[PDB]
Amino acid sequence: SSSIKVLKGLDAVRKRPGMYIGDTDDGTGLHHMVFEVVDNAIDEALAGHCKEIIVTIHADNSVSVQDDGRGIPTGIHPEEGVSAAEVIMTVLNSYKVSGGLHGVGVSVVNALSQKLELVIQREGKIHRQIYEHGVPQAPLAVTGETEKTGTMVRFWPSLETFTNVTEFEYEILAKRLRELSFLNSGVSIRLRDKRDGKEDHFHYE
Numbered sequence: 043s044s045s046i047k048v049l050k051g052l053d054a055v056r057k058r059p060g061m062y063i064g065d066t067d068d069g070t071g072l073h074h075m076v077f078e079v080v081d082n083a084i085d086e087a088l089a090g091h092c093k094e095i096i097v098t099i100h101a102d103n104s105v106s107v108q109d110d111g112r113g114i115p116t117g118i119h120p121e122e123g124v125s126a127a128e129v130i131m132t133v134l135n136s137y138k139v140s141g142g143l144h145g146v147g148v149s150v151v152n153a154l155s156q157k158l159e160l161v162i163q164r165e166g167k168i169h170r171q172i173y174e175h176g177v178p179q180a181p182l183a184v185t186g187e188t189e190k191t192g193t194m195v196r197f198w199p200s201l202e203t204f205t206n207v208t209e210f211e212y213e214i215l216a217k218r219l220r221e222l223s224f225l226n227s228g229v230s231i232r233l234r235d236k237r238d239g240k241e242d243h244f245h246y247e
């Protein structure tokens with residue numbers, strides 16, 4: 043079954059996290075977690091659907107990334123038997139430095155997070171799914187109605203994976219988010235730190 047195979051993938055990531063996300067002891071991997079989530083919101087911006095991305099560092103050391111795009115698709119594709127979103131989130135770099143890392147997908151971020159929450163606003167409805175190291179708590183479900191559209195991912199990195207540098211560095215995220223808004227001109231990126239009230243808005247016209 044997909045369940046056993048999904049778990050086998052998630053377990054591969056957790057056993058050699060460095061290989062997938064980058065170094066787990068110097069902050070490379072930790073901050074790369076944010077950038078992987080951001081990258082898919084950037085693709086949605088570049089295709090002309092999302093105008094703003096908001097990255098928030100919370101006081102409990104989680105990070106959320108939200109966009110105003112179309113929302114990750116929610117329907118169940120006949121081949122997989124669960125939402126397309128859950129497939130994206132769950133189905134599947136050691137010595138790389140900073141911008142030399144290659145992209146590995148948000149299912150890696152999910153595997154290496156103690157908790158992750160996905161909230162999709164799409165087709166008139168608010169949809170929610172929660173994960174613990176990639177394992178959904180329940181099927182993606184409808185929790186309300188909305189005229190808005192977009193996707194939000196919030197994740198709590200696992201301290202079973204990350205050591206030494208365990209708390210996000212505002213300056214690392216600021217530097218790279220600014221570079222990303224330069225490298226993908228037109229897209230507005232905001233960074234908010236709830237620990238100390240700092241905010242920035244990066245946008246090149």
Ligand SMILES: CCNC(=O)Nc1cc2c(-c3ccnc(C)c3)ccc(C)c2cn1
Nearest residue numbers: 079082083086107108111113114193194195
């Ligand atoms: C907070 C992070 N934002 C998104 O992931 N936005 C996003 C992703 C989409 C993906 C997607 C998500 C993750 N990985 C991949 C490869 C695609 C597929 C299709 C649509 C319409 C999306 C819309 N918004």
